[PDB]
Write a protein that binds this ligand. Structure first.
Ligand SMILES: [Mg+2]
Ligand SMILES: [Mg+2]
Ligand SMILES: [Mg+2]
Length: 150
RNA sequence: UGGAGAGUUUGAUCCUGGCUCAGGGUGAACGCUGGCGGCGUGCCUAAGACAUGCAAGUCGUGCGGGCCGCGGGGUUUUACUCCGU
């Protein structure tokens, strides 16, 4: 009973003596809407196994989202490859203002109000992976004070 | 209190990168259609050319006259038309 949202399906092809030969890739986000999210990229010879595997790997790659009344502790910009995600907390009533990929990811984390920009390469995958890296790097006031003591 | 991206180069991929679109806006124009009202607003081109009317006057308590309507009788009155407004 994580929710699950199917972010990307694509069909890749490779080559053989007299033939194109296909494979599918599914990007699936999985999450409770209460600070936990997962991203997984699954491949298979048919679509539903890809979606299935994606689901599997996502539940197996999850993250501490430190929410705070439906927004995020602080700004972050993550670059992943040539893709870039910028993330900005927002007060309530703002909505989750984002591209389809990072929207999915943030909604299921339980983000209600946030502001975003996809910069750089928009490739849905590297954007997904970077959104995740962004949230993986969020820290709370408490996380920070803990790091600096005496 | 503030920020969404998508399509298209490949057998397929990543990147680069252009083209393209969704939005808002306007002294608008054109097409189909059109019931009311309020407030705004309407030659963006030929600073081309313009019929016609009107758009800058006012003071008689600055001044002297012409003309007229009266009042008041000059020859009684119209011909010499005298004072007052
Ligand atoms: Mg680009
Ligand atoms: Mg080429
Ligand atoms: Mg008509």
């Amino acid at each position: 009973d994580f929710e699950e949202k199917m972010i990307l399906i694509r069909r890749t092809a490779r080559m053989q003596a007299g033939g194109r030969r296909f494979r599918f890739g599914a990007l699936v986000v999985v999450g409770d809407r209460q600070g936990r999210v997962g991203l997984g990229f699954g491949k298979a010879p048919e679509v539903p196994l890809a979606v299935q595997k994606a689901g599997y790997y996502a539940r197996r790659n999850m993250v501490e989202v430190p929410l705070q009344n439906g927004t995020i502790p602080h700004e972050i910009e993550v670059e992943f490859g040539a893709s870039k995600i910028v993330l900005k907390p927002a007060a309530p009533g703002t909505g989750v203002i984002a591209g389809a990929v990072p929207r999915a990811i943030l909604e299921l984390a339980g983000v209600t109000d946030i502001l975003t920009k996809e910069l750089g390469s928009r490739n849905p995958i590297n954007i997904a992976y970077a959104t995740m890296e962004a949230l993986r790097q969020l820290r709370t006031k408490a996380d920070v004070e803990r790091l600096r003591k005496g």
